[PDB]
Amino acid sequence: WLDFSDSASWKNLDQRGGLKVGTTFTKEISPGYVVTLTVKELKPFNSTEIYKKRVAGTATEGTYDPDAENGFLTSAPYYGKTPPPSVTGAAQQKRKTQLVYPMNSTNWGVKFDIEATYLGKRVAPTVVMADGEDANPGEFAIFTTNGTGWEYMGEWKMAYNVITKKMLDDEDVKRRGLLILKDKSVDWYKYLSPDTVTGGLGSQVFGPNRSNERTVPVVMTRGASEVGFYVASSGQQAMMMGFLVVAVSDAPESYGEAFHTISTRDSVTNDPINQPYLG
Amino acid sequence: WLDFSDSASWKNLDQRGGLKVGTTFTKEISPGYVVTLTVKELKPFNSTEIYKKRVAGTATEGTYDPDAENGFLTSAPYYGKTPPPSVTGAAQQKRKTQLVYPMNSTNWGVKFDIEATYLGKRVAPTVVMADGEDANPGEFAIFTTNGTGWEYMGEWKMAYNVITKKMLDDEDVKRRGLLILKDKSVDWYKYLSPDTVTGGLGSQVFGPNRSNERTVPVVMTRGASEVGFYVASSGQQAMMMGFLVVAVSDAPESYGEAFHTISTRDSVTNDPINQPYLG
């Protein structure tokens, strides 16, 4: 994974230390093997020929804008009130390998020319890409290539779910209006993959998707006669409750009324960022 | 895990098929081993003595409300406009083991009296609990017990992160105002665990937390001279890009200008819910 935080790897940055057309990133990633990235374009997906073809002949054909610029969602309060950020790697270890557009509520893109050399000779590179952040159904990251069509390599720890129109519309109703869908300058349904099964494997466009493997922490209490579950959420949470019976043999009849009637014992106050030591 | 969807396991439901005080859930979970849950209370966390003690002697002491009822966040548009739902298991396999309050934007709780019998004799149960849903820093699930203080058992696939005041305030600024924190009837900072390290292990109150292990899907392209990355998000996404060099030996010089200059090949249209078969 490239370390975009290494400031000496960058040349020809803008006034704010961010990318412009002609910015380069160069790294000798292995002895003799040099990769050079050059910024060719800084434009969002609604400016691409890919998007032009997806909206052709529909009600939203006019949303194709080849002159579109990186910036805020037009529904955001930032739009027109504050300059948008620059694309940057400048930490400003998970962060080090990320290239970001460091404000919320945006529609942006970058296209890089890539060159790899091995002992000074040009070679065909093998490029891997991922979104380092989590994505809900209204959060889109799309990958394009002019090389081989995308091949799934596996999961990187910090098969998956392709975002569909139904998932996006369900998320819109659930949140009572996603900010992104309030931007009427783009047809967001045409950001979604045409391939609802694999999200673009074996094509030159991958995503947008969301990772599908989550876990939940499990806790245990023994000798309870009362358990409570409390929720406050803009969404929904859900109770799971189970019982273990493997050790019933030597289980007591009860932990006792004396134990059960003590007031609920709250957790100790422990905040090491506030108070590093007990003494 | 209890199957709350089994309608015959429930007795004494309300008019809408949901829980009321005195509703029971009964299951013979293993031969001879019967668990009975009885609803003792349907009230949110701001009604508890736990919460009373956390706000005592502060500016928000008046937010303790022993007469509070389950219902919507007072900042939600639903509040006072539509009746709140009932707690229910009624599917209305991951869903089957969940007890839910099936509308968004709520502050609710349930307390159960628990009895376990083995061949008709009362026994001390071993109870496990989890939140079946994902939680962002403004989504709270809290577990209470009058049995042994909570012990961490591990992760259930569908160590963790305790939500802190800093995380909640960062999420508030990131989203430009969480709906939950707009409800001024509760001191949400006193829903957070006093124990920022473990979130209440070895106490009778666990959570609120969020699961900390995510993965990201990785794709690969070979022989690219151009790669693009496009984002649209109410939040932020991030590009990761890497190179593999293991097979440089037999790597070609180039995939060719002829290949590289073909227009970007979009993904095929494949939607099996719309069109189950090609023919």
Numbering used by the authors:
A (entry chain A), B (entry chain A): 1 to 92, 106 to 171, 178 to 298
Paper text:
Bacterial fibrillar adhesins are specialized extracellular polypeptides that promote the attachment of bacteria to the surfaces of other cells or materials. The fibronectin (Fn)‐binding fibrillar adhesin CshA, and its paralogue CshB, play important roles in host colonization by the oral commensal and opportunistic pathogen Streptococcus gordonii. The Streptococcus gordonii (S. gordonii) fibrillar adhesin cell surface hydrophobicity protein A (CshA) is an ∼259 kDa cell wall anchored polypeptide that confers fibronectin (Fn)‐binding properties to this bacterium.
To further advance our understanding of Csh adhesins, we next sought to elucidate the X‐ray crystal structure of the NR2 domain of the CshA paralogue CshB (residues 211–528 of the full‐length polypeptide). Despite repeated efforts, only the dimeric form of CshB_NR2 proved amenable to crystallization. The crystal structure of CshB_NR2 reveals a strand‐swapped homodimer, wherein residues 442–528 of each monomer are buried in the central core of the associated dimer partner. This density corresponds to an extended loop punctuated by a short α‐helix (α6), which traverses the connecting loops between β6/β7, β8/β9, β10/β11, and β12/β13, and occupies a groove formed by the packing of α1 against the larger of the two β‐sheets. The CshB_NR2‐binding pocket is appreciably less negatively charged, predominantly as a consequence of the substitution of residues Asp300, Asp337, and Asp338 in CshA_NR2 with tyrosine (Tyr288), methionine (Met326) and asparagine (Asn327), which occupy equivalent positions in CshB_NR2.
